[PDB]
């Protein structure tokens, strides 16, 4: 039970908090998170996450609490923290520029449309094209980035983040792993949620038993393999 | 403001939460956090260990934060939740056995013999005996636990904590890197404040840069060498 029309989308302005997410990014633009970016609990993620996407507890719990880590504060972030890398934040991002060699932080077009050209022909994305884009975008960051970081964790996040934007920008059910096409690049372009454009909320919650498959199956049709020492270490705060 | 005697020690029941760090349990134990230890957040430690230790925001925002993880809610945690092994606790504890061939949780006084026995002939344990002891415990996990898990990470962390006794029960500047026997016993035997036997709160700030010289000193004197697997890789959250 939530109105949208309370929630409508507004431009982040220019002190406005915005980070690599673009989930969090758009609850922001909608208020569902504060419209400034900042002071942001996991208490906040999980309710906005839920009431914007139906995404449960289950994940936002876990991520939120790996995100809370970016920031100096005790319980709170500013969006922008989440760029830390080595944390959550990744190099073979779906749209940002691995940070070796670039801006991990903003919608970059040109990255992007790796994401935009897959699944030629459908009207929607699809397991399969999220896994030839994931496959892509690694491939490319392992040709210019010298100093490329791609590991069983890496892997694993960015098949969540992939099933995240075809099961949060969904039509159908969420349990088809697809989404059209038009829903998914408001999304990653405007940091928007496509109301407009015919989008509404999933009435199916959406949490770890319904990704974990999609995931998986992402992994699979991604055709990969560990880049070097294979460690899944994160980084456990700022400026260490 | 902070009325240590409003602060009695009371041991804890039965249906109490404590977990493997004696210096939570100790203001757990002295109602500095909650008696039942239950329902902890990041900011409630920080208060505490302000208040009962004179131990700044700086490290306990960092070890709270990472702490949060072992936890299945949103932003606290019970005490025996931090129990969860290889996200904070690890092998070669000073007062505990390793998880794999014995309990990695309660208090253990054969384990603590060794802490207990170091730098013989002076009533104070030092930099020097704290190194001593940790080589000691790290030598007896590598002889007798199959699955022991030693690197760069549990090495320091492990450097963290010899500093954390060294100077919270300390008597006088927590800089000379020295405390009591009779004061660090009670702390790990009784996870007491030591008020009757001469001890008080710090009055000088105990932060990073105050720890971090001693941790180094501490971890160099250890004779310490990487012996295996040294990817320092925390559990990111329960049941995974
Ligand atoms: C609530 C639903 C969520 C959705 C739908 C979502 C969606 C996404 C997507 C699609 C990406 C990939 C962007 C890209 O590769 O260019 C991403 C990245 C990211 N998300 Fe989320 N996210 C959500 C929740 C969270 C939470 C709770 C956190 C942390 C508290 C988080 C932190 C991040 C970070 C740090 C990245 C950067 C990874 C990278 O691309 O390097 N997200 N998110
Ligand atoms: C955010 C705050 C804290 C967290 C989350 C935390 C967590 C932990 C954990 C999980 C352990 C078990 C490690 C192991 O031995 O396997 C531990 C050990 C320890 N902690 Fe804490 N701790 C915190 C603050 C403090 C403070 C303020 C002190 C001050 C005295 C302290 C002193 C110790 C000591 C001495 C041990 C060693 C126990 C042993 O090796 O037997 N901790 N801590
Ligand atoms: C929550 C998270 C995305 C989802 C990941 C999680 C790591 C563990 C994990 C394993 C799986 O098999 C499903 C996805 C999950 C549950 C990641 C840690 C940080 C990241 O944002
Ligand atoms: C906070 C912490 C203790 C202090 C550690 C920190 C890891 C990084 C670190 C490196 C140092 O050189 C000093 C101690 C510190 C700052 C640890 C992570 C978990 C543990 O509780
Ligand atoms: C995705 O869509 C394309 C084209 O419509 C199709 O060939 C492919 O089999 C689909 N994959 C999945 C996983 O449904
Ligand atoms: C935990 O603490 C919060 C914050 O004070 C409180 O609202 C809540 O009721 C508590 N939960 C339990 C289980 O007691
Ligand atoms: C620790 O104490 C012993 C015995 O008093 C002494 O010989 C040693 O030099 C001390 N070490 C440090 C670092 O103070
Ligand atoms: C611990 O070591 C034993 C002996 O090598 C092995 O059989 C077992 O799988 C290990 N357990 C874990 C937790 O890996
Ligand atoms: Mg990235
Ligand atoms: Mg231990």
Redesign the interface.
Same mark, same amino acid.
């Given at each position: 039970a939530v109105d949208f029309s309370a929630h409508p989308w507004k431009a982040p302005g220019p002190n406005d908090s915005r980070g690599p997410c673009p989930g969090l990014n758009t609850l922001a633009n909608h208020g569902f998170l504060p419209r400034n970016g900042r002071n942001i609990?996991?208490?906040m993620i999980?309710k906005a996450g839920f009431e914007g996407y139906n995404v449960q507890?289950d994940i936002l719990?876990?991520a @939120?609490?790996?995100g809370?880590?970016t920031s100096?504060?005790?319980?709170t972030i500013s969006l922008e923290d989440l760029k830390l890398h080595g944390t959550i934040e990744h190099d073979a991002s779906l749209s940002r520029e691995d940070v070796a060699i670039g801006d991990n932080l903003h919608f970059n077009e040109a990255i992007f449309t790796t994401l935009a050209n897959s699944n030629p022909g459908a009207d929607v994305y699809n397991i399969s094209s999220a896994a030839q884009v994931q496959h892509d975008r690694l491939a490319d960051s392992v040709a210019r980035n010298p100093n490329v970081t791609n590991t069983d964790?890496t892997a694993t996040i960015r098949s969540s983040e992939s099933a995240f934007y075809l099961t949060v920008m969904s039509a159908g059910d969420p349990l088809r792993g697809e989404a059209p096409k038009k829903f998914v690049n408001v999304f990653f372009q405007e940091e928007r949620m496509p109301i407009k454009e015919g989008w509404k909320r999933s009435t199916t919650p959406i949490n770890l038993p319904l990704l974990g498959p999609i995931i998986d199956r992402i992994t699979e049709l991604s055709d990969w393999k560990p880049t070097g020492?294979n460690? @899944?270490?994160?980084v456990? @705060?700022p400026g260490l």
């Open positions: 609990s996991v208490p999980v507890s719990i876990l @939120g609490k790996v809370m880590l100096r504060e005790a319980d964790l020492d460690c @899944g270490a994160i456990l @705060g």
